[model samples]
Target chain A: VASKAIFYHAGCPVCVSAEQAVANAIDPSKYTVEIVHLGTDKARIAEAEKAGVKSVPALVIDGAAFHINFGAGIDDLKGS
Target chain B: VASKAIFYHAGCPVCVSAEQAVANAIDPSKYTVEIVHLGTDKARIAEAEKAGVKSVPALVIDGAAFHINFGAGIDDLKGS
Candidate 1:
């Protein structure tokens, strides 16, 4: 089965860029991407809080979150 | 005394946006903003790990962290 991922953010440019990159890299047919906009939704925020997403542009793939720190790259997306 | 803040990220767009907001909101003369890139340095990652910053766009203000999950905003930046 394809994996599920959540991209959470608050209308950040950098996040937009990163999300684009992720979208480009992954085949949508193979993976599911859910973009959660945090500003307008409280449930999304709570979900992010529960997952411990500390920043914007966070990726939750298969229940594990890979936070995009300054050094993260495409390779970092492989495992988690 | 002035305060110190660390913005941690991995070149994500949302982080960039949130960072810009932070810059615009705070007076540089009265505060110090340190951008910590987490991808290149193991020590930085270790530090982030110690602080429990799970995702990108994390803000560490005066030793306390305000992780930018979905709900983080200017108000969240104030207290911590």
Candidate 2:
């Protein structure tokens, strides 16, 4: 299933803002939220990058990556 | 062997403070860090809580949990 995800950069305060935005928009208990950082050693980020997601706070949905945050805060991601 | 870790509170700003402090002070490659939040579903958090961690941002190391942050930042956790 496609869900809201964010690509973050290490030491990027903007990444923290994005994370907080999503966290507030979606409940972690019901959904699995992922935060990808350039410094991460996880294989998942590598795969997503190979799939063409490059940039901090790359908002992903519908199995594609967007170079922006669609709405003010994660409120736009509600029910998404 | 022991590594530095921080217990975070769910949607708790203080826990976020601790996390950033730890992240900035330590390098993730040489050492692994864990941020335990009350909202986490991992069984690991359960084990730690069973051992007696009863608050947000429970600092754990060497199999023990502390209710405090050792130094000004994660710098004190250096080489620990």
Candidate 3:
């Protein structure tokens, strides 16, 4: 069975890089990736919140959250 | 521990009745109900889509979805 990987992003420039990173790092056959672009959507925000995602460019693999930050905190990244 | 119950709706008249029904049917102490009003938001719609909620006046209790309708199909209920 393939592992579920959900990538939450805001479609920012940095987010694009992180998205590419995720695609490059993971084995496509081993995991199923769902890309979620929030784009200032309240519904998407709610979904992300429940999943414990507090920042963009966030990768959740099998319920484990891996946050990629470029020296900025969750507060800064969430608003982007 | 309280079971999480998410009530997804569009704030329609029938949805109100279902909301009341949920309150009347469940014990408050054993459950925590979170009311989500869709209200024609693109963001909210995306959130509900991922939760397996095909229509409004839907209730999700502990990851289980219960869709209530007055004999109409999901196609009928989603518009309202």
Which candidate ranks first by lDDT, i.e. highest?
3
lDDT of 2 by residue, B2-80 (tens): 3544443453554565455333333343234566554555345456556545454444443444442221222222222
- Model 1 spans > 4 angstroms off: A70-80, B1-80
TM-score comparison, 2 vs 3, better candidate: 3
- What DockQ do the predictions score, one after another? 0.02, 0.02, 0.01
Displacement of the residue A53 alpha carbon in candidate 2, Å: 44
Clashes of 3: 2
Candidate achieving the largest DockQ: 1
Kindly list the interface RMSD, in angstroms, of each predicted candidate in the order they appear: 13.9, 16.3, 18.4
Which pairs of residues have clashing backbones in candidate 2?
B7-B57
* Candidates ranked, most accurate by DockQ first: 1, 2, 3
Deviation of model 3 at A65, angstroms = 1.4
Worst 10 residues of 3 chain A by lDDT: A65-74
Candidate 3 lDDT over B1-80, as tens digits, reads: 67766777776786776565433344345567778876756467767777767777766666755454321234544465
Whole-model Cα lDDT of every candidate shown, in order: 0.56, 0.43, 0.60
- For model 2, residues A1-80, the per-residue Cα lDDT tens digits are 42344443332555555455333333433333566655444455556565445554544443444332212222222223
True contacts kept of each: 0.00, 0.00, 0.00
DockQ of model 2, rounded to 2 decimals? 0.02
Error of 1 at B5 (Å): 31
All-Cα superposition RMSD per candidate: 15.3, 15.7, 15.9
